[PDB]
Each structure stands twice: as C-alpha cells, then as structure tokens.
Automatic annotation (TrEMBL):
Range within the parent protein: 32 to 173 of 651
Organism this protein belongs to: Jonesia denitrificans (strain ATCC 14870 / DSM 20603 / BCRC 15368 / CIP 55.134 / JCM 11481 / NBRC 15587 / NCTC 10816 / Prevot 55134)
Molecular-function GO terms, alphabetical: carbohydrate binding; chitin binding; endochitinase activity; metal ion binding
Binding site for Cu(+): H1, H78
Name of the protein in its database record: chitinase
GO cellular component term of the entry, any: extracellular region
Annotated Cu(2+) binding sites: H1, H78
Keywords: Carbohydrate metabolism, Chitin degradation, Glycosidase, Hydrolase, Metal-binding, Polysaccharide degradation, Signal
Any one of the GO BP annotations: chitin catabolic process
Length: 142
C-alpha cells in the first residue's frame, strides 16, 4: 500500500482535496489502488476506484522538467520486484528492488520524459503476491 506524492498522482490530488470534483472512496485511502499485475490503467481495474480512469475530469497537471525526482509514500512497504514507469501506456523505465523491502519514503529519478502533456503510470509490483499498485501522474513536461 502506497502512492506517488510528488509529482502528485491522481489519488494524491483526491486525498489532498486539490481536485474540484468529488473522488469518492479513494480520497480517504490513496494508498489502496491495488489490483492484479499486468494492467496499464490508472485504477489497475480496481472497481472501487474507477474515477481514477476518467479522463473527462479536470485533473490538475503538474509542470515538471524532462528529468524529475518522483517520490512515493508507502504505508505498507511490501517486498518488491520492480517499479515500472510508463509514459502514455508505454514502458519508459524500470527500477529493480530485487525482492527487497523498499523504504517507506522512496524517490526515483525519471529522465528523458517527452515534452508536452503526458500521463505517467507508475506500477509497483509486489514480489510475494499477484498484486501491483497503480498510480497515474498527469504532467506537463518542458
Ligand atoms: Cu499493501
């Protein structure tokens, strides 16, 4: 259980009250976007949190550079295989945790992000269950 706090994920923005609209349940537990491995959607297909997939909402975007430090807050730092970062659905970078427990405050540097408006999906794969955690970050790269 955990989520991306900077640049803020969609669930982070819900939890911070930064969205103009009601996100529902997710605003009370941004750490909980858990779903089976292998998805490339913002909710991972977790039906409690389908709002996270809705691109029609006016999701706030964060202005970032092409290289950016991305920070997770983990409430339950499960043993981890990989952290996979996708840009608009395509795999961009992979960080190998080698089956180890990550720190509860974890920062990864993403580089070579394409300029303009994009959505980064961070997929956190748990090494000892079939679940991953799904975090979308709407960004404008310049
Ligand atoms: Cu968890």
């Amino acid at each position: 259980h955990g989520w991306v706090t900077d640049p803020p994920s969609r669930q982070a923005l819900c939890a911070s009250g930064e969205t103009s609209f009601d996100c529902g349940q997710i605003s009370y537990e941004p750490q909980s976007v858990e779903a089976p491995k292998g998805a490339t959607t913002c909710s991972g297909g977790n039906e409690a949190f389908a709002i996270l997939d809705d691109n029609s909402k006016p999701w706030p975007t964060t202005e970032i550079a092409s290289t950016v430090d991305l920070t997770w807050k983990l409430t339950a730092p499960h043993n981890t295989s990989t952290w996979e970062y996708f840009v608009d659905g395509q795999l961009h970078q992979t960080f190998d945790q080698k089956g180890q427990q990550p720190p509860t405050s974890l920062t990864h540097t993403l580089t070579d992000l394409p300029t303009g408006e994009h959505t980064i999906l961070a997929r956190w794969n748990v090494s000892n269950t079939n679940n991953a955690f799904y975090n979308c970050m709407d960004v404008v790269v310049s």
